[PDB]
Structures are given as structure tokens and as C-alpha cells.
Write a protein that binds this ligand. Structure first.
Ligand SMILES: COc1cc2ncnc(N3CCc4cccc(S(=O)(=O)N5CCN(C)CC5)c4C3)c2cc1OC
Ligand SMILES: [Mg+2]
Ligand SMILES: [Zn+2]
Length: 307
């Protein structure tokens, strides 16, 4: 409802605030405005949302707040590209974002593998992401929760496949390959949005851009969210030491003073290329890239004192 939110939710750098009880209706507004008002049945969507929340954990960063925030980014990169994505893609992607870290425990796929976690045995590749999709499907199959019930069986299978690929694409390991393939398409002029295999890549890149979106907010938000990101990284580093393994410095709390250098690394190697390639394919997403560059600059001031 709020008027300040009705306005500021269109900004890419929107922050969803500290009131957890407002997040559901922020998400329903977004879906209403993106997809339609009669496209989802309110009462069923409302409980689907509540059940997703319940299945997210009280971790510092990969939590319910993150889930709604990634959804908001995707809303801003749907609103600003009217006519490029189908009604089905718009429904699936908003839901994929809300669901994409379901039951995340604050640990990377490497750590589950080195820990010999049961989930690893089950899903060899992209371990957590396969689990998230599996949990999404389980939420949908719960009675009263099939937000997709108004849909043909074929359209159902289609949206679940859109959701599946988008969730899987949040495995940052896949991004590097995806982005390389897209960058060659851009430059040879071979990218074809009429081609479904190419559309899959573009959505994958969109899922990355949205998942990383802490680095596109204004500096006070970005800096604060970074505290939560490192809180998980350090906890994982502690768990790695407990296994008998020196963690990379990124995850070693004893190397906390190198966070600024760490951020230079991440922005140059990951974030700037991600949002550059995104901007090349979808020019209206330029504000994401601009904010990312501003944030890189801030990390650059921090290294030399200025902050
Ligand atoms: C907003 O801040 C974030 C957000 C991040 N989001 C998610 N993954 C992050 N990880 C793990 C997956 C991954 C894959 C490929 C490259 C990187 S890297 O470029 O940062 N760098 C590679 C070289 N290594 C020695 C140290 C890390 C990362 C870093 C990350 C890291 C991060 O700041 C450090
Ligand atoms: Mg994830
Ligand atoms: Zn995420």
C-alpha cells in the first residue's frame, strides 16, 4: 500500500525494508503489476507465499529477505523491458526468484561436497540449486498451494521448466560459461531472442544479475548487506577448518581486513562483466551497471582510507 513504496519500488535500488510482514504484499503487488491481477488466485498465492517463507532458514544472508529482494530486482528488469518476455516467463521468473534459495543453510556447494552431505550424493552438480527446485515442487504439490492450477497441463510443465532452469542458473559456477557464450553472441551479432535455447541463456544471466543485486543498491545498503554475506562466508570458513581444510581467504575470518581487496576482486571478475553483458542485451538495465560501478568506486575509496 504505502505511497512511498508504490513509487520507490520501481527504482532498481529499492530496498524492501525491515518489516518482514510487509514482504508478502510487496511481492503480490509486483506479481499483480507484472503478470496480472486475475492471473493468480489471491488466497492460494497468499498461502503459497507463506509456505515458502516458512521453509527459508534464519541464516545471515541466504534468507527470506534475500528471496524477496532478488524477486524485486527481477520485477525492475521486467517492468523496464515491457514486451520482451511472455506472460509465462514473467510468472515463472518471479516465482523462481522467490523460491531459488529455499532451505539454504548458509553453505556453498563445495562445502556440502567436502562434508560428504547426503544432498551431494543425490545431486552431484549444482547441489543446493537442485534441492531448491525440488522444495519448490514440494511446496506446489501441497494441497491449496498450486498457484498454477488455472493452467493447462502442458503450460504447467512449461512454467516448471522455466522455474527449474532459472533456479539452476543461480549456481554462480554456471554463470561464467553462460556469460562467455552470451558475450560471443553479442559481438558476432548472433544472439537471437526468437531462439528458445538463446532465451534460456538470457534468463540465466538475468537470474545471476538479480541474485547478485546487493552490489547494485546505493552504498549504505550495499556496505551493510556485505556484512551479512561475509557472516556466512566466515561461518563456512570455520566449518572448513573444523574439517581439516584451510579455507580460501574469502572465507577465513582471520583475513577480515582484506575484505576491500576481496570486493575489488568480485566486482572486476564477476559483477561488472555480469551487468555489462546484461546491459548489452537489455539496455534499460543500465542503472544496475551504473550502481555497480559506483560501488566499485566506494570499495576503491575504502582501500585508501577515505571510505
Ligand atoms: C558481493 O561480494 C561477493 C559476492 C559473492 N557472491 C557469491 N559468490 C562469491 N564467491 C564465490 C563464487 C565465486 C566464483 C568465481 C569468482 C569469485 S571472486 O571473483 O570473488 N574470487 C575468485 C578468486 N578467489 C581467489 C576469490 C574469489 C567467487 C566469489 C561472492 C564473493 C563476493 O565477494 C568476494
Ligand atoms: Mg542460491
Ligand atoms: Zn540467492
Amino acid at each position: 500500500l504505502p505511497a512511498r513504496i508504490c513509487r520507490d519500488i520501481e527504482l532498481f535500488h529499492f530496498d524492501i525494508g525491515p518489516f518482514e510482514n510487509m514482504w508478502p504484499g510487496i511481492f503480490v503487488y509486483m506479481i499483480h503489476r507484472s503478470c496480472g491481477t486475475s492471473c493468480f488466485e489471491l488466497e492460494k498465492l497468499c498461502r503459497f507465499i507463506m509456505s515458502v517463507k516458512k521453509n527459508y532458514r534464519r541464516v545471515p544472508y541466504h534468507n527470506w529477505k534475500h528471496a524477496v529482494t532478488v524477486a524485486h530486482c527481477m520485477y525492475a528488469i521486467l517492468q523496464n523491458n515491457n514486451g520482451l518476455f511472455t506472460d509465462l516467463e514473467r510468472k515463472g521468473l518471479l516465482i523462481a526468484c522467490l523460491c531459488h534459495d529455499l532451505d539454504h543453510r548458509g553453505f556453498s556447494n563445495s562445502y556440502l561436497q567436502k562434508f560428504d552431505h547426503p544432498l551431494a550424493a543425490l545431486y552431484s552438480t549444482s547441489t543446493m540449486e537442485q534441492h531448491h527446485f525440488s522444495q519448490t515442487v514440494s511446496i506446489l504439490q501441497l494441497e491449496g498451494h498450486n498457484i498454477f492450477s488455472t493452467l493447462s497441463s502442458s503450460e504447467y510443465e512449461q512454467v516448471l521448466e522455466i522455474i527449474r532452469k532459472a533456479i539452476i542458473a543461480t549456481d554462480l559456477a554456471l554463470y561464467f560459461g553462460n556469460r562467455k557464450q552470451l558475450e560471443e553472441m553479442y559481438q558476432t551479432g548472433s544472439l537471437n531472442l526468437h531462439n528458445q535455447s538463446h532465451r534460456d541463456r538470457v534468463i540465466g544471466l538475468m537470474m545471476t544479475a538479480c541474485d547478485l543485486c546487493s552490489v547494485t543498491k546505493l552504498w549504505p545498503v550495499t556496505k551493510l548487506t556485505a556484512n551479512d554475506i561475509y557472516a556466512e562466508f566466515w561461518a563456512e570458513g570455520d566449518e572448513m577448518k573444523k574439517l581439516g581444510i584451510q579455507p580460501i581467504p574469502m572465507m577465513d575470518r582471520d583475513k577480515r581486513d582484506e575484505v576491500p581487496q576481496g570486493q575489488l576482486g568480485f566486482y572486476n571478475a564477476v559483477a561488472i562483466p555480469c551487468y555489462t553483458t546484461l546491459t548489452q542485451i537489455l539496455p534499460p538495465t543500465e542503472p544496475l551497471l551504473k550502481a555497480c560501478r559506483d560501488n566499485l568506486n566506494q570499495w576503491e575509496k575504502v582501500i585508501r582510507g577515505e571510505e
